[PDB]
Amino acid sequence: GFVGIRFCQECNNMLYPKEDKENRILLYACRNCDYQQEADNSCIYVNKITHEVDELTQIIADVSQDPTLPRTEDHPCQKCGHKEAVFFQSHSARAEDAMRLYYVCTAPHCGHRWTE
Amino acid sequence: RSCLENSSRPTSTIWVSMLARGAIGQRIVATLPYIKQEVPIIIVFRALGFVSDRDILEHIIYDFEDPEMMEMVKPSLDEAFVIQEQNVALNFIGSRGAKPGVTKEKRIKYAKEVLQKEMLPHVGVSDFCETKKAYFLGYMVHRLLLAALGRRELDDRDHYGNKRLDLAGPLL
Amino acid sequence: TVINNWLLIEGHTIGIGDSIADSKTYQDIQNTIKKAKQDVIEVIEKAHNNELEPTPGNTLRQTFENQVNRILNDARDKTGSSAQKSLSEYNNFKSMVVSGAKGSKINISQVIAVVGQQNVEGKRIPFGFKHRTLPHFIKDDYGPESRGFVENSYLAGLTPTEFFFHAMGGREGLIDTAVKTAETGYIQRRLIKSMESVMVKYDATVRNSINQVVQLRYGEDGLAGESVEFQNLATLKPSN
Amino acid sequence: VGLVKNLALMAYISVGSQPSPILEFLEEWSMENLEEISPAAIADATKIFVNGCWVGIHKDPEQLMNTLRKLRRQMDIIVSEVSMIRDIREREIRIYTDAGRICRPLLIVEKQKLLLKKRHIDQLKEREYNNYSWQDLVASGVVEYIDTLEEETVMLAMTPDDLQEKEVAYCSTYTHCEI
Amino acid sequence: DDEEETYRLWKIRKTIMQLCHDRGYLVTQDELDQTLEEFKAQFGDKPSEGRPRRTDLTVLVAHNDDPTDQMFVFFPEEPKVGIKTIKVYCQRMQEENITRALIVVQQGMTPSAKQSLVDMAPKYILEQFLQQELLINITEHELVPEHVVMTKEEVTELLARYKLRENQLPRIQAGDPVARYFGIKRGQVVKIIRPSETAGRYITYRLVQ
Amino acid sequence: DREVLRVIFPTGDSKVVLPCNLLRMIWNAQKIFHINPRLPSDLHPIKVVEGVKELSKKLVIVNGDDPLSRQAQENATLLFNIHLRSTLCSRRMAEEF
Amino acid sequence: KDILCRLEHTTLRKVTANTAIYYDPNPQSTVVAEDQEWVNVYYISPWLLRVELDRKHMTDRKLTMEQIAEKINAGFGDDLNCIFNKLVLRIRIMNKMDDDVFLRCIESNMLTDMTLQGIEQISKVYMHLPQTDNKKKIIITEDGEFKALQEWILETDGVSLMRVLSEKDVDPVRTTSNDIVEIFTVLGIEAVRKALERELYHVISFDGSYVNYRHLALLCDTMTCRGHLMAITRHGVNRQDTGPLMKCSFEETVDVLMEA
Ligand SMILES: [Zn+2]
Ligand SMILES: [Zn+2]
């Protein structure tokens, strides 16, 4: 997937990846403490190029009460069956790549985000 | 562009920029008033009092569950590795000021005055305002990260809600 | 003198009656605009439902804008030609257009049929608000009304959004006039000073002030530009 | 050309107001200040900016926006030239009270109907016999001033013609109408 | 690859043959128009192990006016030609009593090497050509008109007819790629014949500066 | 002259800019002398050939008799002489004009 | 399209879709475990650089895995070790400046700087059959008629005229540029005079207007009179052999008179 950040426990700085020459394992090392923790996921770096199309997580559920957004009745919510949804487009660097319509259910306390 | 909204000193703009790619990452720096050189942003956060990286990234990144925004702040943490204490960061600020006095404590006091009265004065100029200044500076960094991630659209110079009009009152 | 004194007999006007088409032409114009707006809605529904595939060389945005602009330009051209066919031989707009004296056919089309698409820096009207051209439209509206296609003629008059979009389009010509007068004059002055002393000498060479030969004959033929004319070579084109 | 502009007829440039009543009302309306929160609470809460100063966070921005709009539409704590902008997508409520904001009056639409009625018109027909004026129409919560940042979150009808139901409806969520 | 280097060697050799023919050296018609396959059969397919050797491709042409005026074409192996291999080439020109040579280099020449080409210019005229410049004939481009280098008698008759001085003619740099192609020095004049859409033909004369 | 034209104008565009509008001048000659185009002409073709030759001898842009000047003269009036021989062709002066 | 792939600059970043620096000390039991079978088919530093390529970008650029691998091998001089067989490369290092950070540095300076194919300065190539007959190929038929036969032409977004003209199956006769300085340094001063005439004619006559040829010819002859490109500026006009009084009347009056 993609690598997060780890934080030291004592000094609460970021943990750098360090390789030990004895066991030859991966360990995340604080570079201000003597703290070291053993790695759990051995991926140090990930760079995405084309696999970041998914804006469905970036959408929040609060946007359904935007009065300036279009509303539709043709696409019902798959979660709660509500007839009415707010649709809009991608608002990002990859907005030039599509008019993929993202739909948000307008029912209060549902907030289901879907596409097509 | 920060103005005190009642006292109306000369409006002290602060820039928080990212360097272009053309270095092992893309790096966030600050352009403070009365500091003729740039400062990397994590040194400014350590000069404001927060020494740990978790505290600084709590002031910048509000949800730790998106690591894409973590990947962009790591170089700024990397070149502020050598700076781990508040007075060390304040010396870093003061050694780039308008007239850096050779006394170390003079540099410390000058940097404290710059980051209190001349950096983000609309947030506050009194004492005990470093948490609010850090929260707003982290907000500026967070907005810069969002615009660089494509997650927020860039601002328009000529959008007219971004403008204000000086009538006879403010001019006089 | 002769033509101006005959115009006292004949006369020449332009009225509000010359800008008016018959009801058949108005119905044809409205049908063309309606069908074109429906084509733009169909292209929008194709782009929403991922059916729109890009043409080679362009992404989905230049191809969507190209398709919508092609539909709307074909609308404006077709309905302008429909307006111009309605014009009688008594029409005064047509009198000044087909004589070349003043105005063109796009002026007749805009006055009678449709003003057309308003353009700011080449594209359609930009999303100056957050994803809206004006706060009277919904967000992410790419239809013709939303992005500056004026649906009415100057005779019928513009809707308030069309009025503002037309003012945005017309501001471009004013800005372009000012900046082009600023820059072209400097270009002209630099052109003059680089060649002000170049002249045809009495040995028919073209020299500068240094007496350096620029051309051995003026224009490579030795002729002046006033007396020459467009002619056709007879033997170049036909087959053996 | 384009660098020298003129006001439209109903355009009003705001004079400025002290943000202190806004701040006191926000403090007494379940807003958590910045200095007394854990930073973990910011992620799913609405940041509140007053005159460009981040002053705290709120957990319920929808009812807060309704409350601020009510208070401005009856002018209790919030004067009529204060602009409340809720940017929903990025979870920020921006309140501006400072001078120089250019704002225009718009009629208020609630549930596809104008709040301007025939009683308002019949009572404005008698401005000298009645002492009913524009300020009583602002205080009625019927018209309100919308600056340019707030205009970017409103949905305007050009005319009340836009509010009657069409066979295919463009927008049923108009919030304001052009005068 | 060894297909994209046999092609390069054949192309630069064909351009060298055309350059030598345009400069008046006796190049036969068969080697002006040799097919790549004839180049394969004459030299070989694998320049990596060296079936065509770069020192095997050396050309010796002689002028049409006199066989004494001979001109080498040298293809050094090293990408950056230094002083020592220029001295090897100059020693070969000493022993063969030959005044002119082209050094078709691959990547370039060191600044002292270009300086050394300049210094020898009284005794031996040595010319640098990158092999990038000889992958095409620039004189066969449609923008490049026909250049004819005139003899001194033709230049004298030119300046006598138009009552001219050399500094009053138009100029062409000695480092102009057509000027480098024709191997012309400062003080020579090229006759440039170009078609004209107003006149049909126009002959321009350019003094080399 | 045709092959030279093919070299000069390789796109096949015949529209040139030249001094004397020869076709209009032939039309002027037809109207001045009331040339009936339904009758046989009294113009010998060799008169046309010699007249075009001696006309080309006096359309002089470069003045001189040495080979440099006469070559520059042949160059400076190349298209006009090609056009003049094409237009005042002995066949066109008898069949057409 | 073969030529268009030979011309357009394609770095590694153009074809990659994903990259990651895992830690794997034993390739015999790799960590990602979907690369395990073909690494065992294939069978060091523990730091593994893994890139993942896009299928489509490999296809329409006509590239293959061994091509990219040999590009990296030739570029880096076997300082690394590329293993290929999903399109996955597994770059390692054989035999202070630690190899994880150095591997990130190699990844960053390999994504944007290494050239898989194409000329470095050409950003984008467009191929299109022309409509205007100035770019249609014109021949002379067996009848002697002019026939405009329509052929594919490429138009780039950047100039390297030396490298383009040198290519196989590129016309070295008709291929041109709109960069005036590029034509001057590649082809010469008479060629840049003709190219300058063509470019000025295109600018003038795109509007539909017409300027007589002798005025264009005089401007181009003035710009290219002295063997180099004389700009219509103070840097070309005020550097001539004209007098100080002529130069000071144009621009830089006091500087010209001081120098005189
Ligand atoms: Zn630690
Ligand atoms: Zn739902």
Curated annotation (Swiss-Prot), chain A:
Q: Where, by residue number, does Zn(2+) 2 bind?
A: 77, 80, 105, 110
Cellular compartments annotated: Nucleus, Nucleolus
Q: Zinc fingers (TFIIS-type) span which residues?
A: 73-115
Q: What family is this protein classified in?
A: Belongs to the archaeal RpoM/eukaryotic RPA12/RPB9/RPC11 RNA polymerase family.
Zinc fingers, C4-type class: 8-33
Cite the SMART domains for this sequence: RPOL9, ZnF_C2C2
Give the protein name, as stated in the record: DNA-directed RNA polymerase II subunit RPB9
- The gene is POLR2I
**Highest rank taxon of the organism:** Eukaryota
CDD domains xref list: Zn-ribbon_RPB9 (cd10508)
Q: Which Pfam families match?
A: Zn_ribbon_RPB9 (PF02150), Zn_ribbon_TFIIS (PF01096)
One MF annotation (Gene Ontology) recorded for this entry: DNA-directed RNA polymerase activity
Q: How does it assemble?
A: Component of the RNA polymerase II (Pol II) complex consisting of 12 subunits.
Record's Gene Ontology CC terms? nucleolus; nucleus; RNA polymerase II, core complex
Single Gene Ontology BP annotation: transcription-coupled nucleotide-excision repair
- The residues listed in the UniProt record as binding Zn(2+) 1, with positions renumbered to this chain, are 8, 11, 30, 33
Q: Which UniProt keywords apply?
A: Acetylation, DNA-directed RNA polymerase, Metal-binding, Nucleus, Transcription, Zinc, Zinc-finger
- Role description: DNA-dependent RNA polymerase catalyzes the transcription of DNA into RNA using the four ribonucleoside triphosphates as substrates. Component of RNA polymerase II which synthesizes mRNA precursors and many functional non-coding RNAs. Pol II is the central component of the basal RNA polymerase II transcription machinery. It is composed of mobile elements that move relative to each other. RPB9 is part of the upper jaw surrounding the central large cleft and thought to grab the incoming DNA template.
